[PDB]
């Protein structure tokens, strides 16, 4: 099955035995999923189980060289969506994108890598707009980065809580 | 020992036992950093495993970028390891006519790996070398050997 990675993870992240739930610890650190995609359209979900005061998350997609001891979006290897204010980040540049998200929200993550490349984020099933287009070529892994002790849970499919209207994709679980 | 066990040991230990440095043979080479006993695995010639039929297309693509060395290592008639853009320190192992290492294909979980083995006991400071066994080309593209062996055949081809 697709799961949060066993070794490809910042050691200070507290990952559950089932390897779908992760709690952050102190400054931003990151964990990638066990499987990544090079071509096609793919989708997964992340639920914010708990977001205490002064905690945050940057969620999205990472190539294998994205720095695990930095937020997602820190370098050229990843693209991320920040809980606080809905900012999107890439190479440590945050730009206007959506409204924030928080405790109880179910976030959706779409990427399309055709053999025109695109990353789109969803909030409780609703398209938040194209965040990045014509991204770097390579293998992209679902990825989670957390600031302090918030808790999120990832769902790779087959069944999503809020499957998007009129969007063609395969669930990340198909890579299993 | 089952070959997968000494193969993991290889992967866990190669970085500590070898290192990349300047070479008197040519440019950069791989050097022995701790004594290696005979028959032990030294390092894997790692890379992208491709079907043999893709070899020629990739070669002309690489010459269209100017890469002058061949980083492709044939496993058998059907497959090749391509270390031109992705690979490890085994890329830098030079050729010698009196080498102290040899290459050998091993089968691990239905996949083949090219592994370099110590032909004899190898001591710290020695440069690691093996016989490339390049196919013999015509004298318009002979490459002269600078391995320094007394039994040097004077080209890699």
């Amino acid at each position: 099955r697709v799961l949060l990675a066993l070794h490809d993870r910042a050691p200070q992240l507290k990952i559950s035995d089932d390897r779908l739930t992760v709690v952050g610890e102190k400054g931003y650190s990151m964990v990638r999923a066990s499987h990544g995609v090079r071509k096609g359209a793919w989708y997964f979900e992340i639920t914010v189980d708990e977001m205490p005061p002064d905690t945050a998350a940057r969620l999205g997609w990472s190539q294998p060289l994205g720095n695990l001891q930095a937020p997602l979006g820190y370098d050229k290897f990843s693209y991320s969506w920040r809980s606080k204010k809905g900012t999107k980040f890439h190479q440590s540049i945050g730009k206007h994108y959506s409204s924030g998200y928080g405790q109880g929200d179910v976030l959706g993550f779409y990427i399309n890598l055709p053999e025109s490349s695109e990353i789109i984020f969803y909030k409780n099933g609703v398209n938040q707009g194209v965040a990045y287009k014509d991204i770097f070529e390579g293998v992209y892994f679902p990825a989670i980065s957390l600031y302090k002790s918030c808790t999120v849970s990832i769902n790779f499919g087959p069944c999503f809580k809020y499957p998007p209207k009129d969007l063609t994709y395969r669930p990340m679980s198909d890579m299993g | 020992l089952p070959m997968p066990m000494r193969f993991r040991h290889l992967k866990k230990t190669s970085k500590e036992a070898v290192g990349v440095y300047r070479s008197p043979i040519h440019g950069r080479g791989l050097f022995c950093k701790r004594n290696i006993d005979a028959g032990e695995m030294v390092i894997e010639y790692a890379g992208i495993v491709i079907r043999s039929i893709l070899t020629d297309k990739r070669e002309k693509y690489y010459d269209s970028k100017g890469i002058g060395s061949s980083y492709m290592f044939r496993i058998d008639d059907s497959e090749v390891v391509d270390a031109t853009m992705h690979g490890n320190a085994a890329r830098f192992i030079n050729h010698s006519c009196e080498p102290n290492c040899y290459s050998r294909v091993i089968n691990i979980d239905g996949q083949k790996h090219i592994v370099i083995f110590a032909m004899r006991k190898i001591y710290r400071g020695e440069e690691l070398t093996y016989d490339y066994k390049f196919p013999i080309e015509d004298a318009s593209n002979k490459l002269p050997c600078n391995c320094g062996a007394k039994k040097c055949r004077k080209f890699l081809n």
Binding site: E115 | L54, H86
Partner: peptide, 19 residues
Amino acid sequence: FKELDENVEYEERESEFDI
């Protein structure tokens, strides 16, 4: 080159051989 620790099998594309 990008450094690698293990072999990776190349995933050919459907159009891998096409003009």
